[model samples]
Each structure stands twice: as structure tokens, then as C-alpha cells.
Target: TVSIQMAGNLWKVHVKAGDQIEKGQEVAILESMKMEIPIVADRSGIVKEVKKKEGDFVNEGDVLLELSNSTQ
Candidate 1:
């Protein structure tokens, strides 16, 4: 699963369930210092589920989404 590396509000989400994503690709965005930080895939995978949306606040270790990849 993807997760927040720091505390912040989610600014945008660029994918949805059933979508294909590759490692190191942008999946969503977060805000801190009034700046946006993009959250990326840890490994290539299919989007199994999303756990947050725009304006959502998340903390460190919070799962952002679920992914099913070759390593799963």
C-alpha cells in the first residue's frame, strides 16, 4: 500500500481502482508548507482500491491505497 511520508492534506488524486500504475509514478498529491508533494507507487501494480480523496488529511503510515503487483 502507498502511504503518507509526512502529515498533510491530500491535494489531488490521479488514479482510481482498476487503473494500472508503475513504480515511481505519481499516484496522488499532498500539501505542506503550502506546497504539493506527489505520492508515487512503490511497485508496478493494478489499483486495487483508494483510501483517500482530495482534501483528506493523512498521517505517516496511513495507507493511501491498495495495490496488487507481481510481488504481492
Candidate 2:
């Protein structure tokens, strides 16, 4: 799993647990300084868990999701 890029409140989550994701795909969006920053997947995998929910405040290095690699 990768960390969040910025400290912000989670605006929306585009994927759910057990959802398949591709690298560079948008998984979530964060509201930081009034800007909407999309949270992208770093690798292709099946989402195992989502650590935060919409409207949750988070910081950098927070584990957003757990994933199992599909290509492995």
C-alpha cells in the first residue's frame, strides 16, 4: 500500500474494497487548500481494504488502502 500525497480531508472514494484497480487510476480525491487532488494507484491490484472514509481527515504517509497485486 502507498501513502497519501497530501494532508487533507478525503473528498470521495472512487473504489471500494475488493475493487480491481490499475496503476495511475484514480482511487480517491482529497480536498486540500480548496483544490481537489486525485489519489492514484501506484500499482495494479485488488483492493483489500480502505483505511479512511469520505470526510475523514488524513495526513501524509497514511495508509489509504491494502492491495493484493493481480500481476503477481
Candidate 3:
């Protein structure tokens, strides 16, 4: 369970649960204060769950999603 930071409403979540993700990959986009912030994956893993959706309001310390790490 990784807590991804939020920048603003420019969040464009590109991957879904069960999707394979690589480290340092752009998983989502955040737009705040006219700046485009990218939400990236911290480790290589498979998306287990998505806590937020497109246009969903999120704040600091919000749990964006859960990654399984494909360790099983």
C-alpha cells in the first residue's frame, strides 16, 4: 500500500487494477496551481486496487491505490 501525493485536478490515472506497472512509470497526472504533476510508481508491481477515480478530489496522505508487487 503506497500513498501517492496529489498536486491538483489534472489527475489522469492511466492504469487500472491488475495492470502491470514498472518503477518510475507515470501512473497518473496531477494538475495544481497551473503545474502538471505526474503520479509515478515507486516500485514494479501489479495494481491491486484503485482508491480514487478520475475527477475525484484527493488530498495529502490520501491512499491512491494498492500494489500487489506481484510477489505471490
Candidate 4:
């Protein structure tokens, strides 16, 4: 799972469940003042779930997606 550093409205998520991901990949964007923050994947894995959606208000330390670290 991934967490945000602060509260922000979700701007977008680039990955969906079953999507293969690599370390340092931008997975989501959190909006602030019409600006944004990119949420990154810390390690290579497959995205198992996308827990938030665009326009959703999010909080700091909130879980974003559930990731499967296992190889397919």
C-alpha cells in the first residue's frame, strides 16, 4: 500500500488493478491549488486494487492502492 504525505483531492490515478508497475513509477496525482503531487510506486509490483478515485478528498497517511509484490 501507498500513503500520501498530506490531504488533497485526487486528481488522477495512472494505474489500475492488474497493471504491472515498476519502482519509481507515477501512479496517482493529488491536487492542491490546482497544482498536483504525483504518487509513486516504491517497488516493482502488480497493482491489486485502486482504493481511491478522481475528485475524492483524501487524507495524509491514507492508503491508496493494494499492491502485489509477487511476480506473475
Top of the candidates by TM-score: 2
- Please provide, for model 3 over 1-72, each residue's C-alpha lDDT reduced to its tens digit, 9 standing for 90 to 100: 655575466368877989988888887777676777788877778899888887676666777778886335
Clashing pairs in 2: none
Error (Å) of candidate 2 at residue 68 is 2.1
Q: Could you arrange the candidates by lDDT from highest to lowest?
A: 2, 1, 4, 3
Better of 2 and 4 by TM-score: 2
Q: Put down candidate 4 lDDT per residue, 12-46, tens digits, no spaces.
A: 88888899778889988889667778888767788
Candidate models: Cα lDDT each: 0.83, 0.83, 0.74, 0.79
Segments of candidate 4 deviating more than 4 angstroms: 70-72
Model 3: pairs clashing at backbone N, Cα or C within 3 Å: 10-31
Candidate 1: how many backbone clashes?
A: 0
Return the clash pairs for model 4, or none.
Answer: none
For candidate 4, which ten residues in a row score worst on lDDT? 63-72
Off by over 4 Å in 2: 70-72
lDDT of 4: 0.79
Error of 1 at 49 (Å): 0.4
- Compute the lDDT of residue 25 as modeled in candidate 4: 91
